[PDB]
Design a protein around this ligand. Structure first.
Ligand SMILES: C=C1C[C@@]23CC[C@H]4[C@@](C)(CCC[C@@]4(C)C(=O)O)[C@@H]2CC[C@]1(O[C@H]1O[C@@H](CO)[C@H](O)[C@@H](O)[C@@H]1O)C3
Ligand SMILES: O=c1ccn([C@@H]2O[C@H](COP(=O)(O)OP(=O)(O)O)[C@@H](O)[C@H]2O)c(=O)[nH]1
Length: 448
């Protein structure tokens, strides 16, 4: 028997894809140990077939992580901190487990989130192969490697050059605006994405949460930039991420979806970390009302400054066609026949989820990879509408109706359907994903 150790980034968009991959790999006969912080831990009772081991986080706490907030923006600081100071403890924990390794057993490899760029030399120091799971898109990575051309061109200059600002030089699939919002945090991202790229290239293999027919324009870049083998597996086509939810599913929403006609409900979720002016919040609700479409709206507490929740909503916007909830099994909702469209913040999991369920999109974004994802889906795949100019009453309602009801948007509806079908075909025998997965399984067994 061969064991695989997976090490996720403790946030919802990173734990979902890696526990999905963990399950896929277990279905291939590997045994699974998940290294994880106590912080943001999943429900281990949802994984009786996995062994969990909690690290880096343990209660005699480091000065650098002991007082970090558990939600909002600042919680993400754990990622730079653990990267810069967790090598010693990761090495001990890995080495302890290999030492207790049973007779019949051998650790095939370590698989980490690509942001755990410190794990590469730790693994090397043990003569242990490390593979990388990318949780953002091939296209996004293509932009990271092209940063130096963006910087020297002045695109990553937040204050001024403000100038050309439609269509990027040498990267025509982007506009200048996309680049500016994605890398507006240049100070921190510049350093981190360097190390992430550098250590992903130096790894033993990269697993991408994607599929060849989703991002075919991007395959050449990955082959040329990454010497190790790459494997494209659309994790949502294998199973949803409900078992790794960090929140309680609202569960009442399916009885409500069962009361709606087919393709007639807008699903709306702006991301677990994002934030809006209280004003802009009221503008969003304005567009929904003005769309005349039924909607299911996930709103995370804190989405509105300064309220706990949407207190600033004039009570009774919802009425008949609208509902607001705090958390759902998102992909299961996207699979329900009532859903006709997904207004998303363009998180990569949400985008891939919607693509794998056949649901066309309305895109907003809040930087990082999000504007890139919206640009790509809306302009290249053409499976949604990108509200790329903020939050205006009518533009919002036009996009929703165009996707959901307008004749003019049939091609968007149809494109989503065709792309889902292509995702399904790629899992079958002789499909891109099927072979990517067959190769990954073969490859890992040869490491052992
Ligand atoms: C790659 C990233 C490095 C970091 C580090 C923190 C950093 C910053 C968030 C950029 C803004 C300044 C701060 C200091 C901040 O947290 O406010 C960057 C960029 C995003 C990081 O990634 C995760 O952040 C999680 C929530 O904080 C998201 O839930 C997850 O899905 C992200 O991948 C988090
Ligand atoms: O009500 C919700 C909202 C989101 N999610 C899940 O949370 C993840 C969010 O990841 P994404 O990359 O799309 O956005 P992020 O919040 O990390 O920026 C996705 O897997 C969603 O299916 C969910 O299960 N229920």
């Amino acid at each position: 028997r061969r064991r695989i150790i997976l090490f996720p980034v403790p946030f919802q968009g990173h734990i979902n894809p890696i526990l999905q991959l963990a399950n896929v790999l277990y279905s291939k006969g590997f045994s699974i140990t998940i290294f994880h912080t106590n912080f943001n831990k999943p429900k281990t009772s949802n994984y009786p077939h996995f062994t969990f081991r909690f690290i880096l986080d343990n209660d005699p706490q480091d000065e650098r992580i002991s007082n970090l907030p558990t939600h909002g923006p600042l919680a993400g600081m754990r990622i730079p901190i653990i990267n810069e100071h967790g090598a010693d403890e990761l090495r001990r924990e890995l080495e302890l487990l290999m030492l207790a390794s049973e007779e019949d057993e051998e650790v095939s490899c370590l698989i980490t989130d690509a942001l755990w760029y410190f794990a590469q030399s730790v693994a090397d120091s043990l003569n242990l192969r490390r593979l990388v799971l990318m949780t953002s898109s091939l296209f996004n990575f293509h932009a990271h490697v092209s940063l130096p051309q963006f910087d020297e061109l002045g695109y990553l200059d937040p204050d001024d050059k403000t100038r050309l600002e439609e269509q990027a030089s040498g990267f025509p699939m982007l506009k200048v605006k996309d680049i500016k919002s994605a890398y507006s945090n240049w100070q921190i991202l510049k350093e981190i994405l360097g190390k992430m790229i550098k250590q992903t290239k130096a790894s033993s293999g990269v697993i991408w949460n994607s599929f060849k027919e989703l991002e075919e324009s991007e395959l050449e870049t990955v082959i040329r930039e990454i010497p190790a083998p790459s494997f494209l597996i659309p994790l949502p086509k294998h199973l949803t991420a409900s078992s790794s939810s960090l929140l309680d599913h609202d569960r009442t929403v399916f009885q409500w979806l069962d009361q709606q006609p087919p393709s007639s409900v807008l699903y709306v979720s702006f991301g677990s970390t994002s934030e809006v002016d209280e004003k802009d919040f009221l503008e969003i609700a304005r567009g929904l009302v003005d769309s005349k479409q039924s909607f299911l709206w996930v709103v995370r507490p804190g989405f509105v400054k300064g309220s706990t929740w949407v207190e600033p909503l004039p009570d009774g916007f919802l009425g008949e066609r609208g509902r607001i909830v705090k958390w759902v099994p998102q992909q299961e909702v996207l699979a329900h026949g009532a859903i006709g469209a997904f207004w998303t913040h363009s998180g990569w999991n949400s985008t891939l989820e919607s693509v794998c369920e056949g649901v066309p999109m309305i895109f907003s974004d809040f930087g990082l990879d999000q504007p890139l994802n919206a640009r790509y889906m809306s302009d290249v795949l053409k499976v949604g509408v990108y509200l790329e100019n903020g939050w205006e009453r009518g533009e919002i309602a036009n996009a929703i109706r165009r996707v959901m009801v307008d004749e003019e948007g049939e091609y968007i509806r149809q494109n989503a359907r065709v792309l889902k079908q292509k995702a399904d075909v790629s899992l079958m025998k002789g499909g891109s994903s099927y072979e990517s997965l067959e190769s990954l399984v073969s490859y890992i067994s040869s490491l052992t």
